[PDB]
């Protein structure tokens, strides 16, 4: 009943330890939601974009360790706004195993420092809202330690921002999604 898409920041600003912590965060969310009606898909972004597995591909091999372990960090600039657009258009397409009438969740894991993107958040959030994609945001590193990155997290987060911004150092985001999905 729910299609959860991950968009992970692989840019040069994500240190290797945090990028590890992103990998085990995503793996734990999938692993906790196996044997349920949740399908999963992942895109890594920096200035280039790699779909490491689609909704259809997770359906054919629902092993979170096997899907996440070979993921290697891209580095480079931070094209977050373009990354948002590609997830909505490519990952949440029926051709990739996404379901039309499902609960659409995007999980963005970044440090909140878009850099070099030709697109703005103002240009991509209406597209996400049009498909009913609920957007959760996981701040990493020093994301919460500068006023610029914090106010960025609200712009990307869903309409009640207080329900949708969390940290990667805990799994409070997963509990909120689980409580959300149980309500659904």
């Amino acid at each position, epitope marked *: 009943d729910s299609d959860i898409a991950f968009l992970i920041d692989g840019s040069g600003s994500i240190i290797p330890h945090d990028f590890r912590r992103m990998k085990e965060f995503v793996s734990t969310v999938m692993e906790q939601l196996k044997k349920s009606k949740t399908l999963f898909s992942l895109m890594q972004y920096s200035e280039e974009f790699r779909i490491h597995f689609t909704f259809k591909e997770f359906q054919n091999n629902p092993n979170p360790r096997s899907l996440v372990k070979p993921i290697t960090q891209l580095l480079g600039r931070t094209h977050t706004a373009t990354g948002i657009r590609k997830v909505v258009r490519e990952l949440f397409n029926i051709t990739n195993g996404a379901r039309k009438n499902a609960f659409k969740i995007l999980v963005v894991i970044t440090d909140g420092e878009k850099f070099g993107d030709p697109l703005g958040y103002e240009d991509v959030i209406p597209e996400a809202d049009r498909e009913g994609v609920i957007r959760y945001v996981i*701040g990493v590193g020093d994301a*919460f*330690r*500068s*006023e*610029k990155s914090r106010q960025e*997290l609200n712009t990307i987060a869903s309409k009640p921002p207080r329900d949708h*911004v*969390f940290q990667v150092n*805990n799994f409070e985001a997963l509990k909120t999604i689980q409580n959300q999905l149980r309500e659904k």
Partner: nanobody
Amino acid sequence: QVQLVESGGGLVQAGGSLRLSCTTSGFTFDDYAIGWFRQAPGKEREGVSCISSSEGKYYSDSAKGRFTISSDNAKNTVYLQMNNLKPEDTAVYYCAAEWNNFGRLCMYPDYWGQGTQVTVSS
């Protein structure tokens, strides 16, 4: 029960300094990150600073370099030392608390104090 009581406000000349105090009670002090917000009337609201035992310290762009947030863990009180104050810093200063296990450094506080007036004149 839950209280967040601001004190240390008032009128100060430009270039002066003030130390605000946020004396807290009615909750376990260590479970929460405590932060400072401000809103002058007819102006937008701003985050200023926050202190968490696990996530460290946060300062807004206007606050960094001038301001210092600190915590007296024994008396459950958080202080904001504000140096080099300016007339544009005139606002009602609120202290607030957020459950620290979210790890967000006071982005969405769960409790708000009543606020105290800080005035900065030339």
